[PDB]
């Protein structure tokens, strides 16, 4: 949510929605410069080859639009592709 409703109770679902709202609010304001929802893995690799786990199509970047055509590899900084990897659209080049 930072980036199975039947299993949860209704109060539990409201609580989870409130927790997601609290996370978005904590990121929204002070300490907004760092994405608190960002991955806790240390930035071991500045650059890493990336290609689509799925053919999602065009995708946004800092200053570019990249097609996610099936089995299309790239060479980009890990930070920009971290969100796309969180989406699951691109995996391991």
């Amino acid at each position: 949510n930072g980036l199975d409703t039947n299993n949860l109770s209704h109060q539990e679902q409201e609580y989870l929605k409130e927790y997601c709202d609290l996370i978005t609010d904590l990121k929204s304001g002070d300490l907004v410069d760092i994405d608190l929802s960002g991955s806790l893995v240390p930035p071991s690799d500045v650059f890493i080859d990336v290609r689509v786990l799925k053919d999602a199509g065009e995708i946004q970047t800092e200053y570019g639009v990249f097609n996610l055509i099936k089995d299309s590899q790239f060479f980009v900084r890990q930070s920009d592709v971290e969100r796309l990897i969180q989406q699951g659209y691109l995996q391991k080049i």
Binding site: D49, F66, N67, D71, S72, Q73, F74, F75
Partner: peptide
């Protein structure tokens, strides 16, 4: 060519 471009660090796309 892709290896050369990776050495050059120039970002690019490859589509067969």
């Amino acid at each position: 060519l892709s290896l050369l471009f990776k050495k050059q660090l120039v970002q690019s796309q490859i589509v067969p």
